[PDB]
């Protein structure tokens, strides 16, 4: 307990709160979605509700340590409010995202962080054709709200969304689920922003 | 990281928290709207729900710095709770506005600040005629709640709302969307308050 | 900025937080309702939802200053969390009141404060007869929850509720709207509590 | 203002925050109910919503003072967050209780406290027979969640609920409303826990 | 009060906040479920709502004391925000869990802690067959979100869920309710995570 208490104290005191990435000190966040359920489809407003886990990984030099200096501690768990986190946002939500899991991250001696928030998202989607054989396709972009491609870059380990935890008895069955990196420009800003586009084809499951 | 940490420290210590504008030190906020979706229309209460982005720009001498003094840093991202922000409010909302994006602003070396919150608004609007060819027209005023024209002035870059991000498969199609600056008087107060009037003409989209 | 920064600093440091009124140091709050809309009527639970602005005015010796001592500053805007505010409560609400406007007050050199919160209230009201020619009458009392008449007194500038901002295309039209001061006794307490009774007669508006 | 400011300062500084009652230092809380309205009855989930006021009273030696030492101040109003309050909980709620009134208590020089929160409760209740002549009976227990009889005891002044403020035009009329002290044992714990059982018989009101 | 005030002061000052368990300092949490009610079943989204109490027990060397050193105090009640608590989470919730009881734990001189939060959970469950004689079976896993089996182990005193407080007049009757310990692997992580699987068989109750 003493060693971890010391490590946590030293990582916090060694330097003030990390000010986020810069053009000169950029960061690459690895995103990966685990789609658990398509809960609701609303045809009167064209909103669809998803339950998923957004897996996030990044590395920070400021969170690095030598295990030999801190009782061979290789990693630890900490509140996500105690460390810097990326501002990964759904670009087309219709409601504030609901967080379903504790806000705790895992920090490793190499400075790498893993943070997996489970969330419920309500986003823009016309479900017309959900009841058909072909089903309906809907997409939502995820990325930083304020950091461009020069400050925050995004990466995926695979183009395939994890469906190994998708609720079998859900009202909707998944025909396809894709997560692909893309670089866009916006009216507000001159720099190119980067995002992970979550595209999911689904239909009503027969009882 | 060191340079930005220093800049942020020096900008905060240079003077206590900015007390907002005054008659003697007025401010001009540039407002612009990017209408993403008309989510819901409720004819039983006469409420309409919009999803949009509110681009806000202002300039503060207190936030100015020389990039040559801080490792050629030209701008930075910071929590909107760490800086003064204008109190732009919808004058005719029926629910507390829901914030859909992170509360982070961008501050530039000339002292200018850009903050683009994404929000969901539920406001007063009779939708009667939404299903007709002509559609229905509804308006909502945005402006400071406590600062008059002598303290906060508002400006737009264009009278035409940004519709380049409007959800194509929305239940409602946009016939027209306008943003106009106007100056009004109220019973409470002797000074003229200024606002940006968002007027949007819309109808039900055919499948 | 310097003068206002100084005034605000001196007003906070000159004395600890104001402990509220007392029998020995009583206060008079001026109440005034601007009814903007009757949003919803629910006949299955007998609840009615209103959108209104509650103008509150009071004077405090502790908030007084000499403009000649602070660069001819006659007034300033401040967060309502930074100053004492009265606990004006609806005595018959069915839901926690939703605040629709920023929590900012205007303080003047004579120690007077003006605070205008915009709110949505869900209160006890049987709407039977709303569809009739005569319409329905419903009332809700507003007053301090813990302070009696000896500590907080209430006053109105007119017995007429401001209807100049009432939404024209509302589902309900106003036949009459009154705000009267009244003094009552309760089982709990020996002292007389005072309230402002909001009485509004309304009916369904024809297209 | 000076005397009250001083009293409140001295009451806070004389000793650290009160750690709650103990077997050695027990406390007796007096509960009372003022049932204002039976808002909703839901037969599809078996939930019933009440709007009531809970009068709570207890005495603490730590909150005692001599009025002659503090400008003949006999009592004062304070935020309920500034003092210890009991964990009186509804044992069978289906939703987190909504607080409708400000969280302010009244403290007297003898150390006695009075706190009357107005709340909306959604609790377990099968309404089958609400439309009959006999009506339906439903009950909800109120007690401390963590303190047993040896630490917190409960008392009522009357066994009759206060119905003098019950909304006349409510959808439901009260046939009977009782508040009775009872002592129970639970599977978790060996000590006897004490509660106040709120039993109310009601039916649908005829127009 | 003095002795407890001292004990609480000494337990807080003797060492900084406990950093949670480690591979080298693991912890075993005992889980128990008291199912109070199956509130709602939604066949249009496949969500089911439960009201239950989750009894949690763990022991910490850092919370140990000698009663003879602190006026024969054997235990005390404290805010759960003042002590470390495990991040026991429902792995398949569709909404953020609603807490229905005060967040207070009971700490004993041997360092053991008992914490019983009453909660409302909305989780993934197809209710098809709830109206049949056989009823429907639904399951939800509870475990730590970030700690593996090497850091947090789980244990149950019985496989049988406590039904002695189940609301008799609920819309749904319980046919069976089980709580069994299980060890799983996940896509994210290499270490085995452990959970308590809550399996409940229920059907619609006949009036
Ligand atoms: C602080 C305190 O009262 N400690 C007591 C002590 O007087 C006694 O020797 C013993 C006998 O029952 O219980 C303990
Ligand atoms: C800044 C602007 O015009 O809009 C950005 C929001 N987005 C990502 C959906 C198009
Ligand atoms: C720069 C800024 O604040 O945000 C706009 C949203 N975005 C990222 C897609 C263009
Ligand atoms: C000063 C104040 O609270 O304002 C009330 C109405 N308004 C918003 C137009 C000026
Ligand atoms: C006189 C006063 O309180 O202002 C209300 C103006 N309004 C409704 C548009 C906010
Ligand atoms: C004195 C106190 O706690 O409040 C009781 C309810 N009241 C005063 C509004 C009628
Ligand atoms: C304790 C007491 O008598 O209060 C009732 C609260 N009231 C009448 C506002 C609804
Ligand atoms: C351990 C436990 O919660 O037992 C029963 C409490 N009760 C009846 C409120 C549900
Ligand atoms: C002891 C504890 O934390 O919780 C038990 C619930 N109760 C109040 C009925 C006995
Ligand atoms: C490991 C972690 O950080 O959280 C992921 C969800 N879990 C634990 C059930 C696999
Ligand atoms: C990232 C990963 O594989 O974790 C899933 C956790 N679970 C099954 C609760 C949904
Ligand atoms: Cl301000
Ligand atoms: Cl940041
Ligand atoms: Cl107060
Ligand atoms: Cl306590
Ligand atoms: Cl932790």
Walk me through the domains of chain B, giving residue ranges and CATH numbers: 1-207 (2.70.170.10)
Q: In terms of Cα–Cα distance, which of B137, B136, B126, B133 is closest to B206?
A: B133
Q: Report the residue of chain E nearest D17, measured CA to CA.
A: E5
C-alpha to C-alpha distance for C117 and C16, rounded to whole angstroms? 25
Strand, helix or coil at C200? strand
Structure token digits, residue E176: 């069976």
Distance CA B15, CA C134 (A): 62
Residues 6+ apart with CB under 8 A from E100: D89, D93, D94, D95, D96, E51, E117, E118, E119, E120
Instruction: State how far residue B104 is from chain A, nearest Cα, in angstroms.
Output: 7
C191 is in an annotated binding site: yes
Question: What gap in Å lies between CA C163 and CA C176, rounded to an integer?
Answer: 9
Q: How far apart are CA B180 and CA B198, in angstroms?
A: 7
| Residue E69 tokens, joined | 């050193």
Task: Write down the residue that tokens 């030696």 correspond to.
Answer: D61
Query: For residues C105 and C115, what is the distance between their CA atoms, to the nearest angstrom?
Result: 5
CB-nearest partner of C77 from B20, B25, B95: B20
Question: What is the token pair recorded at E17?
Answer: 């906040």
Residue A2 has phi, psi (to 5 degrees) of: -55, -50
Pairing state between β A152-155 and A27-42: parallel
Distance from residue A130's CA to the centre of ligand 1 (Å): 74
Q: What are the tokens at E184?
A: 């799983």
Element (H, E) at D105: strand D104-108
CB of C165 shorter than 6 A to ligand 5:
yes
- Residue D187 is encoded by which pair of tokens? 């599977």
CA distance B112 to D125: 58
Which of A4, A99, A207 lies at the smallest CB-CB distance from E96? A99
> Can you tell me the distance from the alpha carbon of D87 to that of D142, in angstroms, rounded to the nearest whole number?
10
B1, E9, B115: which is closest to D15 by C-alpha?
A: E9
CB of E71 sitting under 6 A from ligand 1 = yes
- CA-nearest of A138, A180, A136, A133 to A158 is A180
Give the chains touching C; criterion: ≥3 Cβ pairs < 8 Å: B, D
DSSP 3-state assignment of C145?
Answer: coil
Give kind and range of the element (H or E) at residue C89: strand C88-90
Quote the ligand 12 centre to C15 CA distance (angstroms).
22
**The token pair that represents B126 in the structure block:** 């009779």
* Separation CA A33–CA A48 (nearest Å): 17
Residue E93's nearest CA partner among E147, E40, E154, E49 is E49
3-state SS of chain B is CHHHHHHHHHHHHCCCCCCCCCCCCCEEEEEEEEEEEEEEEECCCCEEEEEEEEEEEEEEEEEECCHHHCCCCCEEEEECCCCCCCCEEECCECCCCEECCCCEEEEECEEEEEECCEEEEEEECCCCCCCCCCCEEEEEEEEECCCCCCCEEEECCCCECECCCCCCCCCEEEEEEEEEEEEECCCCCCCCEEEEEEEEEEEECCC
Contact D48, D127 (CB under 8 A): yes
Best of B106, B115, B165 for a ligand 2 pocket test (most atoms within 8 Å of beta carbon): B165
Which residues from chain A sit within 8 angstroms of residue E151, using beta carbons? 77
Task: Report the DSSP pairing between strands B27-42 and B152-155.
Answer: parallel
Alpha-carbon distance of C161 to C32, in angstroms, equals 7
D95 burial (CB, 10 Å; 0-12 / 13-18 / 19+) is middle
Give the span between the Cα atoms of D32 and D56, in whole angstroms. Answer: 7
Measured CA to CA, the distance from residue C53 to residue C117 in angstroms comes to 6
Q: Which of B183, B26, B103, B61 is nearest to C77 (CA)?
A: B26
**Cα dihedral across residues A185, A189, A195, A201: positive or negative:** negative
With a CB cutoff of 8 Å and minimum separation 6, the contacts of A198 are A33, A139, A140, A141, A142, A161, A177, A178, A179
- Return the closest-CA partner of residue A174 out of A158, A162, A192, A157: A162
Taking the C-alpha atoms of residue D4 and residue D72, their distance in angstroms, rounded to an integer, is 10
Are the C-beta atoms of E142 and E198 separated by less than 8 Å? yes
B vs C: CB pairs below 8 A: 82
- Strand (E) or helix (H) holding D198: strand D193-204
Ramachandran sector of residue E206 (left: φ over 0; alpha: ψ -120 to 50; beta: rest): beta
CA–CA separation, C2 and A45 (whole Å): 51
Q: Would the annotation count B75 as a binding residue? A: yes
Q: Give the phi and the psi of residue B145 in degrees, each rounded to 5.
A: -85, -35
The CA-based angle C28-C30-C36, given to 5 degrees, is 155
* B193-204/B172-184 β-pairing: antiparallel
Neighbouring chains of D at 3+ CB pairs under 8 Å are C, E
In angstroms, the CA D205 to CA D167 distance is: 12
Q: How far apart are the first and last CA of chain C?
A: 52
- Could you say which of A8, A101, A114 has the minimum Cβ distance to residue E89? A101
The tokens of A97 are what? 């995202």
Q: State phi, psi for C86 to the nearest 5 degrees.
A: -75, 145
Tell me which method was used to determine the 3D structure: X-ray
Sign of CA dihedral C114, C119, C123, C129: positive
Tokens 């001026």, residue located: C30
Handedness of CA D170, D175, D181, D185 (dihedral sign): negative
Nearest Cα to Cα of residue E77 among D82, D154, D20? D20
CA B133 to mean position of chain CA atoms: 31
Span from the CA of B103 to the centroid of ligand 13 (angstroms): 9
Cβ neighbourhood burial of D13 (10 Å; 0-12, 13-18, 19+): exposed
* Chain B environment of A15 (Cβ under 8 Å): 1, 5
Q: Is C168 helix (H, G, I), strand (E, B) or coil?
A: coil
Alpha-carbon gap, residue D101 to D110, rounded angstroms: 25
* D152 contacts D26 by C-beta, under 8 angstroms: yes
Q: Distance (Å, rounded) from C-alpha B170 to C-alpha A45? A: 8
Could you give the count of Cα atoms lying within 13 Å of C163 in the half-sphere of its Cβ?
19
Half-sphere exposure of B49 (CA within 13 A, CB side): 20
Cβ contact B–C (≥3 pairs, < 8 Å): yes
* SS3 label, residue C154: strand
Contact D92/E167, CB-based, under 8 Å? yes
Q: Give how far the C-alpha of residue D145 lies from the chain's centroid of Cα atoms, to the nearest Å.
A: 13
Give the pair of three-digit tokens for residue B146: 């406590």
Beta partners for D101? Answer: none
The span from the CA of C44 to the CA of D171, in Å, is 8
Atom of ligand 9 nearest to the CA of E115: 3
Phi and psi at residue B7, to the nearest 5°: -55, -50
Strands B110-115 and B88-90: unpaired
Give the burial class of B157: count Cβ atoms within 10 A of its Cβ; 0-12 exposed, 13-18 middle, 19 or more buried. Answer: exposed
Partner-chain contact C16 D9, CB within 8 Å: yes
Nearest to D94 among E1, E114, E120 (CB): E120
Q: Which of residues 126-155 of A touch E (CB under 8 A)?
A: none
Please state, in angstroms and rounded to a whole number, the distance separating the CA atoms of residues A79 and A95.
25
Q: Which residues contact C206 (CB under 8 A, 6 or more apart)?
A: none
Q: Which of C204, C101, C192, C107 is nearest to C150 (CA)?
A: C192
From D35, D36, D120, mutation site for ligand 7 pocket: most ligand atoms within 8 A of C-beta: D36
Residue whose entry in the numeric block shows the structure tokens 């559609």: B135
Q: Which residues touch B72 (CB under 8 Å, ≥6 apart)? A: none
**Tokens of residue D108, six digits:** 């007297």
Contacts of D111 (CB under 8 A, 6+ apart): D59, D60, D61, D62, D63, D64
User: Rounded to an integer, what distance in angstroms lies between the CA atom of residue C108 and that of residue C60?
Assistant: 10
**Burial (Cβ within 10 Å: 0-12, 13-18, ≥19) of residue B14:** exposed
* Phi and psi torsions of A7, nearest 5°: -55, -50
CB A183 within 8 A of CB A153: no
Q: Give the angle subtended at the CA of D87 by the CAs of D86 and D92, to the nearest 5°.
A: 140
- Direct distance between the N- and C-terminal alpha carbons of chain A, in angstroms, rounded to an integer: 52
**E5: helix, strand or coil:** helix
> Angle at the Cα of C85 (from C14 to C54), degrees rounded to 5?
145
For every residue of E84-149, DSSP letters joined together read: ----EEETTBSSPPEE-S--EEEEETEEEEEE--EEEEEEE---TTTTSSS-EEEEEEEEESS--T
CB atoms within 10 A of CB B199: 16
Rounded Cα–Cα distance for residues E89 and E56 (Å): 12
The length of chain A, given as a count of residues: 207
């Amino acid at each position: 307990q003493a060693n971890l208490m010391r490590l946590k104290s030293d990582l916090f005191n060694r330097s003030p709160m990390y000010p986020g990435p810069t053009k000169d000190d950029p960061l690459t966040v690895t995103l990966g979605f685990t789609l658990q359920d398509i809960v609701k489809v609303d045809s009167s407003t064209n909103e669809v509700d998803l339950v998923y886990c957004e897996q996030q990984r990044w590395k920070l030099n400021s969170l690095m340590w030598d295990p030999n200096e801190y009782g061979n501690i290789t990693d630890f768990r900490t509140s996500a409010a105690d460390i810097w986190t990326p501002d990964i946002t759904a670009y087309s939500s219709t409601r504030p995202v609901q967080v379903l899991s504790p806000q705790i991250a895992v920090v490793t001696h190499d400075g790498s962080v893993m943070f997996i928030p489970a969330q419920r998202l309500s986003f823009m989607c016309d479900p017309t054709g959900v009841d058909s054989e072909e089903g309906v396709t809907c997409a939502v972009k995820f990325g930083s709200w304020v950091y461009s491609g020069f400050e925050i870059d995004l990466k995926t380990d695979t183009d395939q969304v994890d469906l190994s935890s998708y609720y079998a008895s859900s009202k909707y069955e998944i025909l396809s689920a894709t997560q692909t990196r893309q670089v866009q420009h916006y009216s507000c800003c001159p720099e190119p922003y980067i995002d992970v586009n979550l595209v999911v084809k689904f239909r009503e499951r027969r009882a």
